[PDB]
Design a protein around this ligand. Structure first.
Ligand SMILES: [Cl-]
Ligand SMILES: [Mg+2]
Lengths: 195, 243, 231, 241, 244, 167, 240, 235, 250
């Protein structure tokens, strides 16, 4: 199964996402990026049913990009998260619901605060210091509950995330072929190569 | 003024001029008649032979509805065909729900309401035909005539088209001289005569006679065309009466 | 005058001017002749070119193996009506395994034309059609007017100078009706008929268009060096 | 001047198409009368058969809408039959939905509301008819309610319609000014028809044969029309006193 | 058919103007004057009720000033009924935005939508345009205090001070003269009333012929209050500014 | 009830039970029993007094006595034992409340109090809410009112229910 | 639904509604486009009949369609918003399906297509708008400038102007713009655009808006003072 | 006013006859059919010297075997080209072959009379549709907004048509080479054009069986213009 | 067929007038006089029963209509247009309010809905405006007693007292002199009868006058007892006799 984790530190939001795409007993890819840049300071990671995940993320990306061009303004993460939740909340009672679970990491330039949002395919939304989806969530939550501190630095956050991935590799029965890590801060969205 | 440019507009008189113009198209058409006999109805029509190249007996004008109703009309022939097509739908839907073939009065109002509807809106044109129709139902023989306005009544005899005044006069004699009533075979002979007499209004071109009948005794209450010997016997009787 | 703005308006004498204007488009069209015996039915059509570089506009359209028409007026309107006949012929074959009667093809064209004369927004068809066919009651020739009036005839002609051909056929009626089991002689009578409608121009190899249907003859169109025999 | 062709207001705040529809009402040249007894409601109408070729039995302007409701029309027969079919449909639909016979005054209101729409919507023309609905209602008793092309309706102690309505109206007005009651104080409907015919004869100044009149009677739980022979018996009784 | 009776409400004139829009603007020029003034610390909306009566219940009356949400109000000039159709549409859009994003709608986005509806009635549907001009007074945390106007054409523009309805030419000259950028709300209240007092077609400006509203950060700390003035409160501010 | 009120205003007549009955059954029938409404419809109108029952599939029946619900068999047992023709008002209230008591006592799905509504011809309908109170709870042995400060509170705060203030 | 044919042919083969739409454009404030060697500049007129205007919030005349393409217009402002909205939606729709931003030519072809459709559709009148669409194709350094009009025809221009007194500023550009050597720098190109507007504008104060679009989504709008420095230098060189 | 689908007393549709007037105001387009191929030429007619002429697209590819030149309200042609391309590709999808030039033309002409109170008015543009197929070889068609189409050995449409057509009447024979046809289009365009013909204000194109439909380069057309000038100066 | 009138029949004229609305207001002016007066403890609405024929039973024609138990309506202008508006007004009170909130709408919001229906007949395709002006009197818990006027345009205004139709200009002058903010309901009825007498030509009695009040709750008209919070309708139509009693103290 797919690993997507989010941790919100003092001044940034870090998203770790598994790079493996598998359908049954087959590994389709080992370098998959399960992330879409919604806006310059907003990043979304997604896990779920094949096709639905990318289609939903690209659909949300297009709508948020349309808003940005039309108003020459960046929607706040709180606003972007609410838009995404509502699209999912529509889809559950639709003919064929989107089976996608998303993490939204954003930096709010107005409040100068990082924000992490966890949304499931039903449109269930919460703001959290740290979050995860799937089997991985059970383990990582307990570990983050002990170690996480709210005034942590980005470097401290990466080390804790590094520990979570290492422990997940040992404890998880499926091979998720490592993770891709992306940081969201005031300067924007960057990818951490060394992990 | 301008009250006559649009259908469904009332004139200061309270008249629909577009409907009154439709009646002019009807008055321009060939003569068609209907005679109500003891146990049925007879229909006859004048067919103008424009050219020798017209195939005799081929361009049939009288139209059957269900199996028991005859329809003949004067004016725009296509408008008549359109009305009969609707009549055939109405007769089909009635029989489908109620089983029994549509009574004649019931069928009359179905055409009546449809024609009247083409006087309610300016998006449509009134019908350019007067329709003589009828047949035999459970309550006996019925003859009806229907105008572009949607107006219809029951008739002892009916006539419309260019030779209607002549025809009406000949029908009025039969009503007076036969209070006890007229037989189906007599009504075929008389129908032939009245069309030949009414042809004086269309005397330029020669014509072809076309008769149909529904009689309880003679056709078992079904609509049939008069053909062969019986048609020739009626033509002979008609030709003898004009000479 | 005031009553020709649309097809939904009767004139004070009970005339439909938009229909009468549509009827005028036919008279402007190039001449086409139709005639039949007991065994065969023939269409002859004079095709019209734009100039010497241009082709000669096709006049005859096949509707089924046993039926087809010639057109005079708006070609696009002939395409719409011929397509409708093709469909109705096709429906009869598929559903009832029955070749559509020529008389019933007439009744269907009439009713399609009529609807365009009684409704606002629409317009009458601007074309006249000569339908020939061989069915279970033998050879047939029909004349269609966009008023909705359809007429069964031994012979006829429509288009510019059609009256010349129509008079010839009215004289020859007793001769050409008896031409049974001789297709070449029936076409000769059709080519001699259309010849009575020509002025200045004569029948050339790329000018003349002939179609025939009969007892053991599917509806076939002859153009080019295939009609050189009859010139 | 297109404000005279469709149902839009004129500068005077008038609807000319409605006014012209009222004129169409008298095109038939027929006069109708409606009165109320103790137990019944009677409606009489002039019958004119000008053509000898007509079947006189089919020439009628009185309609049996439901078993309880009768309708006489003043106007051309196409519009009369249009209104008749619609009222018959509306009466039947009412009974199905609400489980009791549509009252006379409620059908009147419904047909009047339909009429109002033709005065407000352009694509529909008014019907050139005045509808007089009669019944013995199970709540209000003997009932006369009348509709017109404006979409107006009201109840009536008695009423008259057609070219000579004012002559009949005043004749009835004068009778009810004497008796000082809202009805004909008579037991049998036969004598209430005799009153209706008598007061029409006095008002129009014309004598009637059996074929000149057309009579509709509403009693408790049925509305029916009289035959020529039923009218003849009514005419004989009037002459013999 | 029906073509005969069609006014064709959405065609250009040979000069490339929209007949029905131009005629609607003529209508609005006869409506009671509405003024909006934007200051550093708030916005003022002042409007004149059209020739009232002594038997009109004023305290329960509203024809000029309408609330769209807690942050945005409009002054109306034209057909009141037509305005109420558009006001209810705007109120719904504002609540749609709040439901979708969980943030109060920015003023311009609401203005642009209402303007885009008006535009549509000029390009398709064959219906008459809305005979209404709006002054939008609003606050959001992007652009702060904002004044906009829209007209039947669907065109909208931003303003420091603006007038709609009757005698706008005169009203706009008086505002352009006395308005300064460093101006405060108390000053803007005085300017608005002084401008109506000079432009009015009435003999004198009284409390019973005015509707008045302020949007202030004069709300305890970091928030925004809308104040629709009561009849007695309009009477008091008329005495304070020295007009009665 | 809404559509009946609009019908009453339209016709200028007091509503009839047969109308409410007809409208209810046609609605329930449409939804093929998926709207699980089982109703006993009573009333007086200008036609007289009426008593109907309506089942969720859209069926209706007429009777002098009817019962519905889980307690219907307990209630019908009393009605079938004590009902006669030509009951007085006092007798009919007694019979009706007794039939409900049978349901309260012997049916687990029924309980608490008896609500009655009397609809007499040419009178106002009287709605007797809690006509009987056969099941009133007894005094508890102990007051479970706690001493103040018993509950541990992490945080306290004033909630602003007032609108944005002036000045 | 309202079906009425408002754009029809006249006996001389003209569509008057489309020609009257061009009259709406003629009334609009002047807009000019000039492309240099490595840039495109969009100059726009602001009529000074409206003061007490809030320039922060008032709709600007140049609208970004994507990060690399801009649209200016002359004509009905309300009508322009509908074309801008449709263009912005199509720009994101193209990115979503082709996985590449629109070329300037493609975005033009789309907007021109919409304008054409509103000239032979029932119940609708043509757009009273002409557009200048400028930008750089993805991973291209070749400047692009296109024009559209109510009929729906479009074409590419070395330089072009639309709106009131466009005949005058086109006259200026036709003699002052050399094809063999276009404005080499941003300075030269902005100068020639300001010069072209100064032929028509009135005062060089808050009446001229300038937007510079460079390759790789580099778009900036010049301020009052920055434009005022160009206005000063042009007239000081003219005094000779 | 009056119906959009109204007939005139002469039996012609007003709106169709009026659209034909719009086409007469259009820039000239010429087509010549030979046994070696079909040539298509157009006048570009730029409204100003600042207008980049190469952006003027009045010759358009429908498929590899069918070219198209237009004259009139050229914006109206975009949806007709779109339909033509869709028809050509759709037919290749359904039948695994190239569609006949006549069938493609017939498809475009079926849109023509779909107007009333469907689109609000007829098309204000005429098309020259040139192509090759195996059945009827090299073909040139003229598609009008009436819905009528004629095949032509050679045809001119637009402002200089009746002058050009009279020239084509004399010059065309059945033995013309492709090189001869190119020069002949350039010759007649140069005759009817207001401005002096060069490689920037005129555009050539051809359709051969081998190479398919090609729009000529400005450098290639320039050489054929220089070849024309010399052969006219040769007598 | 089909309604091919998809376009507005009410347009702006070069002068900025909406012709069809002006012509509708002209139809209202021709209409019989109706008035409304608001007291401290109630509201009164009144009009003349202009009987078309003496044979006609004028009781069967209701000019004063109950919209909700606490809201009444009277009109001046075209009667049929009023009758269909009353039907639509009664229905919209249920569909747009009572079926949502479980209570009857307050006066001002029901007025707002009637106003909307009339505005739409002013802009929608293939329809003319309504040829009526309505006076709507009502009570609701939070707004108390109120009186509103609604015009063909869809515009509405609240009134202390007013009059519409034939003799409105004279009636409004009479009301301006008599009205104070200390009127009891009986005082307002007395003034209503005095004002209406001026615009009536013929018979002036309970049979020719139609009068209704919005006042105290009428538990005697509720039709059931048992629910304390349901105290009965505030709308009451005065009887023929009740009007004649107050014409002796006139
Ligand atoms: Cl109704
Ligand atoms: Mg009407």
């Amino acid at each position: 199964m797919d690993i997507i984790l989010g941790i919100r530190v003092q001044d940034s939001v870090i998203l770790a996402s598994s790079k493996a795409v598998t359908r049954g007993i087959s590994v389709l890819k080992d370098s998959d990026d399960k992330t879409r840049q919604l806006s310059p300071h907003t990043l979304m990671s997604f896990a779920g049913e094949a096709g639905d995940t990318v289609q939903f993320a690209e659909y949300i990306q297009a709508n948020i990009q349309l808003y940005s061009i039309r108003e020459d303004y960046e929607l706040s993460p709180q606003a972007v998260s609410s838009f995404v939740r509502q699209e999912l909340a529509k889809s559950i009672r639709s003919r064929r619901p989107y089976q996608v679970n998303v993490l939204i990491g954003g930096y709010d330039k107005k409040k100068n605060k990082p924000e992490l949002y966890q949304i499931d395919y039903l449109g269930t939304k919460v703001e959290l210091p740290y979050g995860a989806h799937g089997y991985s969530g059970f383990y990582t939550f307990s570990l983050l509950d002990h170690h996480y501190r709210p005034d942590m630095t980005t470097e401290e956050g990466l080390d804790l995330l590094k520990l979570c991935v290492q422990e997940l590799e040992k404890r998880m029965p499926m091979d998720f072929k490592g993770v891709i890590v992306k940081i969201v801060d005031k300067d924007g969205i960057r990818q951490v190569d060394d992990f | 003024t301008g009250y006559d440019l649009s259908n469904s507009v009332f004139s200061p008189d309270g008249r629909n001029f577009q409907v009154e113009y439709a009646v002019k198209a009807v008055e321009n058409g060939t003569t068609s008649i209907g005679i109500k006999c003891n146990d049925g109805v007879v229909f006859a029509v004048e067919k103008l032979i424009t050219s020798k190249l017209l195939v005799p007996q081929k361009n049939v004008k009288i139209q059957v509805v269900d199996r028991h109703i005859g329809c003949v009309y004067s004016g725009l022939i296509p408008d008549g065909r359109h009305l009969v097509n609707r009549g055939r739908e109405e007769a089909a839907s009635f029989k489908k729900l109620y089983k029994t073939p549509i009574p004649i009065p019931a069928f009359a109002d179905r055409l009546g309401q449809y024609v009247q509807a083409h006087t309610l809106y300016n998006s449509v044109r009134p019908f350019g035909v007067s329709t003589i129709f009828g047949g035999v139902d459970k309550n006996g023989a019925h003859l009806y005539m229907l105008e572009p306005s949607g107006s219809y009544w029951g008739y002892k005899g009916a006539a419309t088209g260019k030779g209607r005044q002549s025809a009406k006069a000949e029908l009025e004699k039969l009503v007076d001289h036969h209070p006890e009533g007229l037989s189906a075979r007599e009504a075929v002979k008389q129908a032939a005569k009245i069309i030949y007499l009414a042809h004086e209004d269309n005397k330029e071109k020669d014509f072809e006679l076309e008769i149909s009948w529904c009689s309880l005794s003679e056709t078992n209450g079904l609509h049939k065309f008069v053909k062969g010997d019986l048609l020739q016997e009626a033509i002979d009787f008609a030709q003898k009466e004009i000479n | 005058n005031n009553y020709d703005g649309d097809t939904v308006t009767f004139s004070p004498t009970g005339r439909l001017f938009q229909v009468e204007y549509a009827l005028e488009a036919i008279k402007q069209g190039s001449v086409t002749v139709g005639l039949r015996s007991n065994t065969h039915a023939v269409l002859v059509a004079l095709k019209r070119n734009a100039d010497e570089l241009s082709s000669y506009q096709k006049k005859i359209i096949k509707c089924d193996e046993h039926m087809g028409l010639s057109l005079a007026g708006l070609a696009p309107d002939a395409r719409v009506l011929s397509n409708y006949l093709r469909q109705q012929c096709n429906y009869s074959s598929l559903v009832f395994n029955r070749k559509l009667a020529v008389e019933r093809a007439g009744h269907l064209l009439c009713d399609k034309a009529q609807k365009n004369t009684q409704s606002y927004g629409g317009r009458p068809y601007g074309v006249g059609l000569l339908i020939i066919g061989y069915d279970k009651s033998g050879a047939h020739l029909l004349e269609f007017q966009p008023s909705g009036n359809v007429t069964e005839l031994y012979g006829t002609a429509i288009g510019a100078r059609s009256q010349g051909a129509k008079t010839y056929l009215e004289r020859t009626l007793d001769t050409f009706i008896k031409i049974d089991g001789n297709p070449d002689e029936l076409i000769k009578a059709g080519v001699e008929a259309i010849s009575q409608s020509l002025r200045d121009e004569s029948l050339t190899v790329d000018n003349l268009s002939i179609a025939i249907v009969g007892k053991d003859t599917p509806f076939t169109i002859y153009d080019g060096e295939a009609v050189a025999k009859y010139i | 001047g297109y404000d005279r062709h469709i149902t839009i207001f004129s500068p005077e705040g008038r609807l000319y198409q409605v006014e012209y529809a009222f004129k169409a009402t008298n095109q038939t040249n027929i006069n109708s009368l409606a009165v109320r007894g103790k137990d019944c409601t009677v409606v009489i109408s002039q019958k004119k058969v000008p053509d000898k070729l007509l079947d006189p039995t089919t020439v009628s302007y009185i309609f049996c809408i439901s078993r309880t409701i009768g309708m006489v029309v003043n106007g051309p027969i196409p519009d009369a039959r249009n209104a008749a079919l619609r009222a018959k449909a509306e009466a039947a639909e009412f009974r199905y939905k609400y489980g009791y016979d549509m009252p006379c005054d409620v059908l009147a209101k419904r047909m009047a509301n339909l009429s109002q729409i033709y005065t407000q919507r352009a694509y529909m023309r008014p019907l050139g008819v005045i509808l007089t609905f009669v019944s013995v209602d199970e709540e209000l008793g003997p009932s006369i309610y009348k509709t017109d092309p404006a979409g107006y309706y009201v109840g009536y102690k008695a009423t008259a319609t057609g070219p000579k309505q004012q002559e009949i109206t005043t004749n009835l007005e004068n009778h009810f000014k004497k008796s000082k009651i809202d009805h004909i104080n008579e037991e049998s409907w036969e004598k209430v028809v005799e009153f209706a015919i008598t007061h029409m004869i006095d008002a129009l100044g014309t004598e009637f044969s059996k074929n000149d009149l057309e009579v509709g009677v509403a009693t408790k739980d049925k509305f029916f029309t009289l035959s020529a022979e039923n009218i003849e018996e009514r005419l004989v009784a009037i002459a013999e006193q | 058919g029906s073509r005969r009776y069609d006014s064709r409400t959405t065609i250009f004139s040979p000069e490339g103007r929209l007949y029905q829009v131009e005629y609607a603007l003529e209508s609005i020029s006869h409506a009671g004057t509405a003024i909006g003034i934007m200051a550093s610390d708030g916005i003022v909306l002042a409007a004149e009720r059209k020739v009232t009566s002594t038997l009109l219940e004023q305290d329960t009356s509203t024809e000029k000033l309408y609330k769209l949400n807690d942050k945005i109000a409009v002054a109306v000039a034209g057909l009141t009924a037509d305005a109420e159709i558009l006001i209810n549409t705007a109120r719904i859009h504002a609540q749609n935005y709040l439901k979708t994003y969980n943030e109060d709608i920015p003023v311009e986005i609401l203005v642009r939508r209402l303007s885009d509806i008006k535009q549509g009635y000029t390009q398709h549907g064959g219906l008459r345009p809305f005979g209404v001009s709006f002054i939008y007074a609003g606050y959001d945390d992007r652009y702060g205090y904002q004044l906009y106007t829209s007209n039947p054409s669907g065109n909208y523009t931003g303003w420091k001070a603006i007038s709609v309805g009757a005698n706008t030419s005169a009203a706009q000259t008086l505002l352009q003269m006395d308005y300064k950028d460093d101006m405060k709300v108390d000053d803007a209240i005085e300017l608005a009333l002084k401008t109506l007092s000079k432009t009015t077609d009435s003999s004198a400006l009284t409390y019973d012929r005015l509707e008045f509203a302020t949007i202030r950060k004069g709300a305890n700390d970091g928030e925004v209050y809308q104040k629709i003035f009561k009849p007695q409160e309009i009477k008091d501010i008329l005495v304070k500014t020295g007009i009665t | 009830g809404s559509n009946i009120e609009l019908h009453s205003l339209y016709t200028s007549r007091e509503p009839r039970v047969v109308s409410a009955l007809q409208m209810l059954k046609q609605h329930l029938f449409k939804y093929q029993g998926h709207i699980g409404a089982y109703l006993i419809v009573a009333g007086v109108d200008p036609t007289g007094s009426h008593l109907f029952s309506i089942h969720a599939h859209g069926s209706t029946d007429v009777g002098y006595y009817l019962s519905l619900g889980s307690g219907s068999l307990a209630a019908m047992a009393v009605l079938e034992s004590h009902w006669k023709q030509d009951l007085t008002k006092e007798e009919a209230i007694k019979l009706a409340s007794d039939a409900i008591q049978a349901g309260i006592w012997n049916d687990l799905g029924s309980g608490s109090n008896v609500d009655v509504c009397v609809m007499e011809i040419g009178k106002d309908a009287e709605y007797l809410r809690n006509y009987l109170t056969p099941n009133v709870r007894e005094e508890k042995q102990k007051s479970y009112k706690f001493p103040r400060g018993t509950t541990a509170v992490l945080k306290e705060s004033i909630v602003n229910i007032c609108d944005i203030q002036e000045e | 639904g309202y079906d009425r044919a408002l754009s029809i042919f006249s006996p001389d083969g003209h569509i008057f509604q489309v020609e009257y739409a061009l009259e709406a454009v003629k009334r609009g404030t002047c807009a000019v486009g000039v492309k240099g060697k490595n840039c495109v500049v969009l100059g726009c007129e602001r009529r000074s009949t409206l003061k007490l205007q809030d320039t922060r919030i008032t709709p600007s005349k140049v609208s970004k369609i994507d990060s690399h393409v801009v649209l200016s217009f002359s004509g009905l402002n309300a009508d322009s918003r509908i074309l801008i909205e449709k263009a912005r939606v199509e720009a994101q729709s193209h990115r979503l399906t082709l996985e590449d931003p629109v070329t300037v030519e493609y975005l033009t072809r789309y907007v021109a297509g919409v304008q054409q459709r509103y000239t032979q559709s029932g119940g609708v009148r043509p757009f009273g708008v002409s557009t200048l669409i400028a930008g750089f194709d993805p991973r291209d350094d070749e400047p692009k400038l296109y024009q559209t009009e109510p009929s729906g025809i479009y074409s590419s221009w070395s330089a072009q102007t639309i709106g009131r007194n466009s005949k005058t500023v086109r006259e200026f550009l036709e003699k002052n713009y050399d094809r063999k050597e276009p404005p080499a720098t941003v300075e030269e190109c902005v100068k020639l655009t300001v010069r072209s507007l100064l032929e028509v504008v009135q005062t060089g104060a808050k009446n001229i808006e300038i937007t510079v679009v460079k390759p790789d989504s580099d778009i900036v709008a010049l301020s009052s003072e920055e434009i005022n420095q160009y206005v000063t230098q042009i007239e000081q060189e003219k005094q000779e | 006013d009056r119906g959009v689908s109204t007939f005139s007393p002469e039996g012609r549709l007003f709106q169709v006859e009026y659209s034909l007037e719009a086409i007469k105001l259009g820039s000239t387009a010429i087509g010549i059919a030979t046994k070696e191929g079909v040539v298509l030429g157009v006048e570009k007619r730029a409204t100003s010297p600042l207008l980049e002429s190469d952006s003027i697209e009045k010759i358009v590819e429908i498929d590899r075997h069918i070219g198209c030149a237009m004259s009139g309200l050229t914006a109206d042609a975009r949806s007709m080209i779109e339909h033509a391309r869709t028809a050509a590709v759709t037919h290749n999808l359904y039948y695994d072959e190239d569609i006949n030039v006549e069938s493609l033309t017939q498809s475009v002409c079926d849109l023509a009379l779909r107007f009333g109170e469907l689109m609000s008015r007829p098309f204000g543009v005429a098309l020259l549709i040139a192509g090759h197929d195996a059945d009827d070889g090299y073909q040139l068609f003229h598609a009008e907004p009436s819905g009528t189409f004629y095949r032509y050995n050679a045809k001119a449409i637009g402002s200089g048509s009746e002058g050009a057509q009279a020239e084509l009447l004399n010059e065309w024979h059945s033995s013309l080479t492709l090189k001869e046809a190119e020069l002949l289009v350039l010759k007649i365009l140069k005759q009817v054009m207001e401005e002096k013909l060069d490689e920037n204000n005129a555009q050539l194109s051809c359709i051969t069986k081998q190479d398919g439909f090609k729009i000529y380069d400005n450098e290639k057309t320039a050489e054929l213009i220089k070849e024309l000038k010399e052969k006219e100066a040769a007598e | 067929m089909t309604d091919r009138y998809s376009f507005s029949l009410t347009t702006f004229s070069p002068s900025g007038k909406l012709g069809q609305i002006d012509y509708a207001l002209t139809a209202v002016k021709q209409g019989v006089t109706s008035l409304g007066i608001k007291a401290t403890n109630g509201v009164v609405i009144a009009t003349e029963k202009k009987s078309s024929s003496p044979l006609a039973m004028s009781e069967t024609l209701s000019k004063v209509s109950l919209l909700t138990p606490d809201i009444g309506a009277v009109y001046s202008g075209m009667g049929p247009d009023y009758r269909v508006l009353v039907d639509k007004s009664r229905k919209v009170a249920h569909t747009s309010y009572k079926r949502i909130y479980g209570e009857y709408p307050p006066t001002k919001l029901l007025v707002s809905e009637v106003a909307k229906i009339m505005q739409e007949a002013t802009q929608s395709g293939g329809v003319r405006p309504f040829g009526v002006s309505l006076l709507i009197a009502g009570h609701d818990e939070f707004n108390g007693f109120s009186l509103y006027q609604v015009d063909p345009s869809g515009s509405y205004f609240p009134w202390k007292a007013t009059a519409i139709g034939k003799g409105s200009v004279a009636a409004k002058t009479f009301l301006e002199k008599r009205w104070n903010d200390e009127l009891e309901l009986e005082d307002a009825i007395h003034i209503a009868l005095l004002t209406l007498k001026e615009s009536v030509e013929g018979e002036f009695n309970g049979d020719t006058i139609e009068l209704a009040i919005i006042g105290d709750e009428n538990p005697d008209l509720l039709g059931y007892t048992g629910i304390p919070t349901d105290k009965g309708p505030r709308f009451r139509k005065l009887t023929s006799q009740e009007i004649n009693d107050r014409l002796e103290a006139l």
